[PDB]
Design a binder for this molecule. Structure first.
Ligand code: HEM
Ligand code: HEM
Length: 254
């Protein structure tokens, strides 16, 4: 009966995992998992939504990450009479259990969610969270934009800290353009980048041509880790696995 639009790759992946695949009629740009979701219509990007694109799908329920903007579009969609359910957007490993809970409560699959939660906690718990003296620089590369580093108050910065590592970039929030001096002062031991960032750059050649990268301990030892964009930053079900790659790569640097 329900025509569900899910917004937020984390939300979508959880809805699908709670067995609602059949009822989801559309989703946002950040939602690309599972692949089944890639075949659904794209209503736009979570951070720049427009009401018309969502309402054209005639949803009965909108499951939306709190990270969604502009907020008044949700108000507007709710006034039109669709059930708008908000999902917590904290970039924290403990936050995922909260996300699963809100989604399940909304789908009336409380028990299914409870099960999914235990599996996530069981997978998360297996990861060594002991702090390690390794500094990490996360870089986001587009095709047509200057490369950018993550400060604090980012998912990337939370991910790094949760793996037991340290954010090489300090003293600022969100993202900033790379500069040779900035990067070099950062002195990362490990360069963290996304799968798409790699494609945007070309080859490993261009990777170490990033401003100042070669003049860092990371660039000297070619210490690199490439992870799926949303797996790394989405704080959904794949969080434990990504923390594992990151932890392993750090431990292996002793
Ligand atoms: C017009 C298109 C886009 C614009 C203008 C844009 C802009 C931004 C900006 C400025 C930030 C960080 C600053 C802030 O949060 O205020 C950000 C974060 C992020 N973006 Fe977008 N973006 C776009 C498209 C996309 C798409 C298509 C994806 C699909 C995966 C995406 C995924 C993310 C994620 C996962 C973050 C969180 C990073 C973190 O917390 O470390 N973005 N985006
Ligand atoms: C940090 C993680 C981020 C991710 C995973 C991400 C992801 C994406 C993706 C998938 C696109 C679509 C690419 C395209 O259409 O060419 C995009 C576009 C865009 N992003 Fe990001 N983004 C991030 C951060 C940022 C930040 C911090 C900014 C700050 C300016 C930004 C600015 C933009 C802009 C202006 C576009 C639109 C380009 C166009 O329309 O041609 N993004 N982003």
């Amino acid at each position: 009966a329900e025509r569900i639009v899910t917004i937020g790759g984390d939300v979508t992946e959880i809805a699908y995992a709670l067995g609602a695949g059949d009822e989801i009629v559309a989703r946002d740009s950040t939602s690309q998992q599972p692949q089944a979701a890639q075949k659904l219509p794209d209503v736009g990007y979570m951070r720049t939504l427009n009401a018309e694109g969502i309402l054209a799908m005639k949803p009965t329920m909108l499951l939306v990450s709190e990270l969604a903007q502009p907020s008044l579009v949700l108000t507007q969609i709710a006034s039109s009479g669709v059930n708008v359910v908000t999902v917590p957007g904290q970039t924290t490993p403990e936050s995922v259990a909260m996300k699963i809970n809100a989604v399940a409560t909304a789908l009336h699959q409380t028990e299914k969610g409870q099960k999914l939660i235990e599996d996530y906690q069981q997978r998360l718990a297996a990861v060594n969270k002991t702090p390690l003296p390794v500094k990490v620089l996360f870089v986001m590369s587009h095709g047509g934009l200057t490369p950018m580093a993550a400060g604090q108050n980012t998912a990337a910065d939370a991910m790094i800290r949760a793996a037991g590592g340290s954010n090489a970039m300090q003293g600022f929030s969100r993202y900033r353009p790379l500069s040779q001096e900035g990067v070099i002062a950062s002195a990362p031991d490990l360069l963290l980048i996304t799968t798409d960032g790699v494609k945007a750059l070309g080859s490993s050649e261009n990777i170490w041509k990033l401003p100042g990268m070669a003049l860092t301990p990371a660039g000297k030892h070619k210490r690199l880790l490439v992870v799926d964009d949303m797996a790394l930053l989405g704080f959904g079900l794949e969080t434990p696995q990504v923390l594992a790659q990151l932890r392993e790569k750090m431990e292996q640097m002793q």
